[PDB]
């Protein structure tokens, strides 16, 4: 069933035989990673690596203890030997903490990988913090998302994601700590 | 690349693509290439031209 | 006609109503943070499918707004 067991090694032998011999090998992107998921270790007790990611930018890399993240069933939470998880998160607040002191990044969603060495990839487009949006502007546009509702699907369904990522800002931004 | 000042960067490119492109043939597959910038657009319609799309 | 997400089951791709999402909450940000949040949004490129090998139609992106939240 996986008769093909191909990798950067076996790409490296079969290359040699069907390119011309001089060319050096074409790198992969294993090459720039030394942290995989059955690589056990990486644990050390009670703050785990948090690779809070974006597309343009890195957020963190750094160790945390707890991390609470918006999964589409809710709010979820990963302490530091969590069970393998693969979850698309809603648009909600990634809680980043280290201790007494809290980091709430709002996302855009996008999904959030717990690997079984411990490793955590939040992996979500557009990740602001919730200092930098303004509590006018989103019921202020979801006064007019609750109002263009046509029967094309994809434009209902735009609609949707649009009164449902309002909505949790809404949510998001009253409920302040 | 989409200017062309830059060297032999493309080149070396398209030639790995069919240096990459030999090495997935095995069975008679299929294959659909693509370039991205207007200097992949010029160069692989020289090697591979009913493969592009 | 697909069966999936909400998204998915609308004929739109994942991709597509990711970034709708990621427009959303880029366009109710902070000033000092909204400008340069567009800089990210901008969509300036274009394509030409090309069938017997050379010939094909052009189409062209210019879009400065986002994603188009129309039908693709």
């Known amino acids: ?177 | 690349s989409d200017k062309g000042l830059c060297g032999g960067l493309n080149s070396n490119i398209t030639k790995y693509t069919r240096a990459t492109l030999a090495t997935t043939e095995s069975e008679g597959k299929d294959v659909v290439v693509v370039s991205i910038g207007d200097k992949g657009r010029s160069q692989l319609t020289r090697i591979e031209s009913q493969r592009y799309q | 006609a697909p069966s999936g997400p909400f998204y998915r089951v609308a004929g739109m791709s994942y991709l597509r109503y990711s970034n709708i999402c990621a427009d959303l909450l880029r366009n109710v940000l902070k000033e000092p943070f909204k400008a340069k949040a567009q800089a990210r949004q901008a969509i300036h490129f274009r394509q030409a499918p090309y069938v017997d090998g050379k010939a094909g139609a052009s189409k062209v992106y210019e879009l400065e707004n986002g994603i188009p939240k129309t039908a693709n």
């Open chain 1, 1 to 177: 069933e996986a008769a093909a067991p191909a990798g950067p090694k076996e790409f490296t032998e079969v290359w040699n035989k069907k390119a011309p011999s001089t060319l050096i090998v074409p790198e992969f992107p294993s090459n720039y990673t030394a942290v995989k998921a059955v690589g056990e270790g990486q644990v050390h007790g009670d703050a785990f690596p948090v690779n809070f990611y974006t597309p343009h930018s890195i957020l963190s890399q750094a160790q945390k203890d707890t991390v609470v993240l918006p999964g589409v069933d809710g709010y979820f939470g990963v302490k530091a030997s969590h069970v393998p998880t693969i979850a698309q998160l809603k648009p909600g607040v990634v809680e980043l903490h280290s201790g007494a002191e809290s980091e709430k990044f709002f996302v855009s969603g996008g999904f959030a990988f717990v690997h079984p060495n411990g490793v955590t990839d939040i992996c979500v487009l557009e990740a602001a913090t919730l200092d930098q949006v303004d509590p006018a502007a989103v019921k202020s546009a979801l006064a007019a998302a609750s109002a263009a509702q046509p029967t094309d699907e994809f434009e209902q369904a735009a609609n949707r994601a649009a009164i449902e990522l309002y909505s949790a800002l809404e949510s998001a931004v009253e409920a302040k700590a």
